[PDB]
Amino acid sequence: HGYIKEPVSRAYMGALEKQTMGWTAAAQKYGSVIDNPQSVEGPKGFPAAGPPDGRIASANGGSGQIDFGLDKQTADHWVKQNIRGGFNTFTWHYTAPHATSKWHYYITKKNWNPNKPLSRDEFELIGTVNHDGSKADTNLTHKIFVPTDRSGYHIILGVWDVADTSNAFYNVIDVNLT
Numbered sequence: 001h002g003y004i005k006e007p008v009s010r011a012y013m014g015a016l017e018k019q020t021m022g023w024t025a026a027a028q029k030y031g032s033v034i035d036n037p038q039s040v041e042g043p044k045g046f047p048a049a050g051p052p053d054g055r056i057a058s059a060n061g062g063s064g065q066i067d068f069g070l071d072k073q074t075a076d077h078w079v080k081q082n083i084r085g086g087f088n089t090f091t092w093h094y095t096a097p098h099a100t101s102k103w104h105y106y107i108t109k110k111n112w113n114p115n116k117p118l119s120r121d122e123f124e125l126i127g128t129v130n131h132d133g134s135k136a137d138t139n140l141t142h143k144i145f146v147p148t149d150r151s152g153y154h155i156i157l158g159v160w161d162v163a164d165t166s167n168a169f170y171n172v173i174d175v176n177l178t
């Protein structure tokens, strides 16, 4: 269990807006993930397997841990944070740092549709961090090159594959890319 803390994942943004807008208004916006941003857990093997299209952001309800709130997708719904093209760092916080096989990072394609549910064919692989089966917290932060050929509203998906289970944690990040 864990989530992307910087940039602020959508899941962690829900936990953050819990504090600023309260439990009910934040749960209306994000669903039950506000309490458990670390629990966006679904089957590993993305993109060939893993959570189905339209259930990527919620990891198909996080293995029963959350609802499907995160799967809403419109131009306006989610809080965007600014990021620049090029090298960026992605830092996870672990509540329970499991043995890790890899992390893998994707961005939305230049022509993606911000008002339809997320599908795996809107995402492009941008980097893979292999790991030696040790705990996730031996490599907290990853240096990933974000494409410099697109701008405006994009989603970075970070995926954390657990070494010793059939599961993975899916963290979408809403970004305004410049």
Ligand SMILES: [Cu+2]
Pocket: 001, 002, 096, 098
């Ligand atoms: Cu866990």
